[PDB]
UniProtKB/Swiss-Prot annotation, chain D:
Protein name as catalogued: ATP-dependent Clp protease proteolytic subunit
Function: Cleaves peptides in various proteins in a process that requires ATP hydrolysis. Has a chymotrypsin-like activity. Plays a major role in the degradation of misfolded proteins.
List of catalytic residues: S42, H67
Family designation: Belongs to the peptidase S14 family.
Domain of life: Eukaryota
Subunit structure and binding partners: Component of the chloroplastic Clp protease core complex.
Free-text domain note: This gene contains one large insertion sequence (IS1) that divides the clpP gene into two sequence domains. The insertion sequence forms a continuous open reading frame with its upstream and downstream sequence domains.
Subcellular locations according to the entry: Plastid, Chloroplast stroma
Transmembrane segments: none
Organism: Chlamydomonas reinhardtii (Chlamydomonas smithii)
Amino acid sequence: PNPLVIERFQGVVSQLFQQRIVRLGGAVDDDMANLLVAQLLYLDSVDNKRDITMYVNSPGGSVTAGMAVFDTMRHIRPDVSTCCIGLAASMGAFILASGQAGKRYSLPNSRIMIHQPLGGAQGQATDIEIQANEILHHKLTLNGYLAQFTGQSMETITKDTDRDFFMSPQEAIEYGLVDAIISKPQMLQSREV
Amino acid sequence: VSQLFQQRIVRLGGAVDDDMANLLVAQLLYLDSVDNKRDITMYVNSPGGSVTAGMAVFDTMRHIRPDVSTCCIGLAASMGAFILASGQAGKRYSLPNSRIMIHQPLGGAQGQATDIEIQANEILHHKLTLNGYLAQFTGQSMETITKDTDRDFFMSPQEAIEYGLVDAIISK
Amino acid sequence: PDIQIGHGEDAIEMDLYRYLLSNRIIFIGGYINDKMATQIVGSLMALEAVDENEDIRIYINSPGGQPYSVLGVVDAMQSIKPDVQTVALGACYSYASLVVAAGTKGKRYAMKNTRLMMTQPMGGSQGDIYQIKATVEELNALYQIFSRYYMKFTGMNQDQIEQATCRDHFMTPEQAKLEGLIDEIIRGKGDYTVPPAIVRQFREVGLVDDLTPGPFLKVDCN
Amino acid sequence: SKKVFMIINSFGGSVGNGITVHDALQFIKAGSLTLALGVAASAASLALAGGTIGERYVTEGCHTMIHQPEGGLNGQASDIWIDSQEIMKIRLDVAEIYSLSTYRPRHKILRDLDRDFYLTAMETIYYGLADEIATNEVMHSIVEMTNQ
Amino acid sequence: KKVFMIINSFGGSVGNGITVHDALQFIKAGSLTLALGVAASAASLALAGGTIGERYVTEGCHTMIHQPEGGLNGQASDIWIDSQEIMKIRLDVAEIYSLSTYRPRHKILRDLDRDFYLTAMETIYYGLADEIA
Amino acid sequence: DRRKPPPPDLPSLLFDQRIVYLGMPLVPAVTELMVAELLYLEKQGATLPIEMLINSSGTTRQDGEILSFDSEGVALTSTMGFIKNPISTVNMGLAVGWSCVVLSFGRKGWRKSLPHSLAMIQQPRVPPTGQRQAIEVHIKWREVLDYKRELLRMFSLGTGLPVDKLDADMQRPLYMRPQDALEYGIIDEIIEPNEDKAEKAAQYWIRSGRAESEGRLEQWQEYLSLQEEYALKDSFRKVMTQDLRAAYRDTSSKLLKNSSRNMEQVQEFKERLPDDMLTENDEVRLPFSRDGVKLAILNAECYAERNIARQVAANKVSVPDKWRAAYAARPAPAAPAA
Amino acid sequence: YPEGRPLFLPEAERFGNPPDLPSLLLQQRVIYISMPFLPSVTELVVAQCYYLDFDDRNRQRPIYVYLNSTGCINDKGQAISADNEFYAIWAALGFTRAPLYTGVTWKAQNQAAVLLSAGQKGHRYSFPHAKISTAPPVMNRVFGQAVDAQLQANELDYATKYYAAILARSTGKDLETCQKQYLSRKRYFSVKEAYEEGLVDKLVPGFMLNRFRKMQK
Amino acid sequence: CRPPGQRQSEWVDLWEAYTYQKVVFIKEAITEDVANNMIALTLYLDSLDQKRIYYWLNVPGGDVVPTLALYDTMQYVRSKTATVCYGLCLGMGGFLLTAGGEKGYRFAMPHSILMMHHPSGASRGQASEMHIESRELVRMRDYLSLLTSNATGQPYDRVIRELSRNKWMDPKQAIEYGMIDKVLTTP
Amino acid sequence: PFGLLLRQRIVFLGGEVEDFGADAIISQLLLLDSQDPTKDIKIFINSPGGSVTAGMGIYDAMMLCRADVNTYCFGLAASMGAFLLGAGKRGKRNSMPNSRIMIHQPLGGASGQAVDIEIQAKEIMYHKANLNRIMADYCQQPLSKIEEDTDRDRYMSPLEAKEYGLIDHIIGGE
Amino acid sequence: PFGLLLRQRIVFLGGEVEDFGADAIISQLLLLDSQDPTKDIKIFINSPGGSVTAGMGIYDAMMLCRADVNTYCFGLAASMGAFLLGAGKRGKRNSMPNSRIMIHQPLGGASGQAVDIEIQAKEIMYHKANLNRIMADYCQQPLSKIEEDTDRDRYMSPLEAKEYGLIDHIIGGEEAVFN
């Protein structure tokens, strides 16, 4: 992108971080997850009590880097309240699910997509078994965690995440992925009737 | 480079081009503006370069006021070698393990019989000018230098001492 | 959308990773190539020069490394004065895996959901018969060095390493703690979920069956 | 010619093709004399073991390498799992075919398909994939059969 | 003695469909047109070009109907001219469909607007085909 | 006989005997050739049969790279419906996707396969649209849906199975060996290998003395020993599981609850008595494991090296140092520690 | 239907010359190996051998094998194919009956040099400026554990001992000697050096230079 | 459109079979290659005898020099020339449609699409090189416009003004404009 | 340059709406919300559009703010500049006199097996219905009319947009 | 962190050694010499090779330094890092217990008219002789043995090298030296 866009965004990122607001944007590769682990550790060191607000806006990401971020969220002292804006999809949705219970939010017009890990197995038959066990372990672990977060059952989750499962935040609340919707009052338009 | 630059060190590194020559010329002119007496030293490590850029660097070296001592580090090859041979007399140094190469100009041409013949005789002009300057710098005659530049002439630093390109070695 | 850093916001406002390194934390991400090994050894020695007695903490989230760079990093870890304390995150894939085992015994940690891995040194033969013999000797020397380091850190037999490295061996923190690669698992706020491999190990000793799988993940579909 | 002579020298090919040629060679009524020149890789080893038992010839300088099916596959976790199970079933099919062609147990065949497995002429005949060294008189007679 | 045209074409430029339709009508002994699987626009024109009474479609076949496509590039007036011809092409295709389906040409233009899919029975009813195999 | 020369090559040689060989991914050229050959073979006579050999990977490479479309198969299958003389379709090697429908679409009772051939069925996929509008995405989905339904209808005519079952099974790759295809409905027969060949092979292995001594006996013994050892180990695992459940029942016979009365209440009036429902709610009974077998003798093994336990009694008040906020957990008459 | 028997030169001289060049050379019992030992060359040479030993009445008419190939190794020294293509060719050329005369046009290298030596004693020809060279066998890059590379080393050592056996039989030397001289390092032979070591035996028959002819005129 | 159609006694390719009847199907945009093939075919067909050569065009465009070479070859041969338009004739194809048989022997199929535009071209170099190329291209525009005007009967100045942009015509507009002479129908 | 205007509470929504760009705009909006609750935020729009998810994310950050969110058009506002332009505070949507405002149904794609196609089509139909409802809510037109207009790319000048309801002021008047 | 180490007279030579990389290191060594002439420098070598020209540039810089220049290899030192590691002051060359040390000739090539081919063969042969001559001097082994060894493609453990004369100390006391 444009360097001036990058510089403006890095400035506003520093301001938000000052206000204890980390953010997870874009595909969650290893680099972003190392960065976000570093930010979470810093915010733990600065203050051990105040909440951290984690901005999730992601279209996907690596299972392994997502779990790096997820363990650091569940290990540090301050409660990481995850808030979804725009799109929490397939690993930002897992991250949004794993925010502090009762403190996961979503703006009204967002989309949550939870599904199972993609991937690929290559090589001789035995290498393909080993790699299929890696992918199936990741799938089972993530479904077990979604069952823990949402209050659903492992089988309902496994049935729901077989293919892409897009959800509005209302359906997410009614599911268990998100706990509240953030919105301000509007003016209810009077109709002539 | 700045860390070297404040030490009056100008690096002619890597094969020369017009951008590298522009950077060298700007450095040399600024450094002459700063101090016209205190010396400039210049590390040479280059496998060649365009003849025109080397000529630009050589003229900028010549007419500025500080002596541009040239110290060869690593290698100096047929256009960085000419630049190395053009440092101030008595101040063309070599490292003990560096190698020095001299060889004729190069370059292509395309166009009509007239245009590519013109490119041919400008290449002859480059060859004549370089041989004349090398004769000025070493002390050998046009014939020995033309024979040397005719075919790839790899040399050791010591030979270059008795063949005139370098003034001394830094074993010190 | 490369990356966007905080600053920590002191009177200087320097880069976040510079701040963390100043507070004695080294992050290892991506392949441990020669530049990464050089940076990690330089960081270890700078932290040693600042204070030779206070703990260094290393976070390892890396998908492997060049074997020689990893051996250099492990040698630097074992040759410095302070306690080195290695926390595994995300993944540590076989060469990085040794980097986790090389922390000060008692201070090797892994996050609850990391994926360690152990593999034979993989290389590759090509060319004349003497180049192929050279490759065989290189890969045998690497196998001996990494096998000896795994023996040194985990206490396993060379036979046990032979079984644990004959093929890509993906391990949870629980196998790693049973084997000796790590010392403590960093859990959540009381998170003790049993991973699928440990459930299978339950099934292999008869603790759970198909009739009574217990409150563990269903691995009846394997 | 009440025999179908099938001359083998091929460095690989998908194992399914080796299975197809093995089944076809075991299906036709007419006999089969399969000769290996130089090499017979996975599918070619299946085609070599597929001939009439007792007429599977291999030269002195031939090599026979048998390896387990290797595949590649991308997609969701369930798709990787299903393709994985299928590739294991193919490995078992190949092990059973070698077991029945050579009379070795499926477990020693499966142990050998663990890694790429090279066999010389004596090693191949001992193992059971071929039955006789191919001396010049063998296809002296083979050419004479095609001519007579 | 009658050209028997088997049609199974997932696509093609519509102008080529017009050209094949003209070639079909050129010969005087009737043409039978049997569609299999799919008959998209450039082949839907060909299917509608057979002899009325002797155009057949198969139970599985689906018919595509759509307006022509085009890319343009040049000055503003070049773009205007090129737009005018693509409109002429679309009007001609609607006219051909009107001749074969005996349906309001404006209605056929409305149906061309976006990609239009017809099952075998809807192909029969629309008028592009006459019978089912 | 001179007047008709020998056929120039192999495809002419086969097609001369009414053998339509479908062996290539079902591309438009292959589909056109198949249609031309089937129409020509009906022309030469609509009572003579056609032997179609299917070693094909459908409309997409096995890699998953889409290479034709979902309508080339519709053309070929509707063609096979159009030609009226009997078609026997033999599966060779691979019959994926539409090439499986074609295998199941031959004359019933004549569909066959080689003993190891694989018949896979999955759901059609399409190449990426390329960021079209919303209505064009809806219209593309309706296109893809109609063609998937066509595939389902033709596969229902082939196998015999409902549309809904086939749709459910198709959602993921479904791999079928000839036993499985014969079960499902794809094929009717399996082309067994020649019997005389197999008999001669067994006789040669016996008579030549190769089957006995080439190293075979030692490792066949090793195979049987490994099988017996692993069967016994699995039996010991089952024994361990059953003893764990027996321990749970030993330590669960000390209970005082009224929830069993509720489980009596919820159940129907007919099952007021314990009366199971012939379903996967199936209670396997361990306690009636009085096998009493006097034949299965314990081998010469010594378990007398196991120590002598303290012989603890559970009728104590001492409790393990745990935490529970419930105070309904009264001490039981047999468990004063509860 | 009828079995169409390929009729050979004694009785096929009445059917004229063949249309193109490769058919001409096949009829002359010349197998011209002009291209590196790829699977295509192996297939073609095996079929030519099968046709030549098919219906020769006397099968004493020798088979000529002219070489213009660097064998199974590319020009830059990295294997372009495997050693099994050579075995298949060599094995095939052995299942015939006729004496196997070999010659070199320009280059017989690394495998074609062995196949050159492997002709009849007294009947190996070369052009007087042919370049012959013997190099150790080369494998192509494969990935794995130390065990895979060890397996490749074993295979390459079988190949090296095979070539050393053929060169020992051809050049009449000690087996390990032939391994040391030829296969140990990539060594070049002029025609005279190759003749000195038994690689070749003669120039092509009738080779007479131009100014030599002039001065005998 | 591959299958060889049977001829007097054997199987001959469809387009060769057509040229055996003097019919020359031009179906590709005129590049150096197709133009050379059609010039060669025209010369040989005139060599066999002199009866007439029908050109069936489906040309969607083409380059200027090869098209003018084909035109000059058509005019050089003794045998007359008629041009029919199956499909469409665009640009230099619409110029070839006005290249054969001025006396009422240009036909078109009912839905054929006709287009004429001033010939394109592109070339750079020195300043004087651009002068020479620009002068030559203006000479080319003028020559092709003279040919178009004398083919259709429209004023030269009218043609210059009309063809500066693209010009598209239905067969009725082409008859009314003089571009063609008759429209083929079922007869 | 731009930062100096951000100091005056002005957000440039320029260039194609993208994931990175929308993330930057949302962060700027949240920060300008935190800095002062009751000072107007001005969003300048010159963009041919972008992803629907990014556009609704920016729309949510716009609606969440406690500050009136003026919108301005400079040149083009196409398919997501237009939706976000009308999504400004009513009575406070301005446009430059010679600027083009295109209304456009959302773009989406689909690839993979028939179930992937069905899921993507269902998602895009949801987005289309949602956007139609929002646009008809702030344009005060029937949902049917919005469906007809968004059917194809409709370009309006600020007069056609002002009568159609997307904007509220034209900065040069007439 | 490298700034503090450069203050401590520690120079890192890591990764592939190249022309620009050499110029940077040469400058660092000259700075450390001109600042302080009595305090030793430490150069750490983890490098898989390099260019002969750049390598000899760094070697000349190392041999100019008045302040004794120790070297400490970690991980790899392949055929040009190993030479520089052998060019530290005698008695002050160190290695990790499990570093891998390689000694080997350079590659090369030439093209076109074979005049330049013979000149390139002569220059590659010069590099061979030059490197081997100084290697023999510091390894304290016969030049014939060094010439033979620099041919053979092989790694060695720091124990083998310490025997061979290249390095002089192993950091770890040969307690973690694994084969």
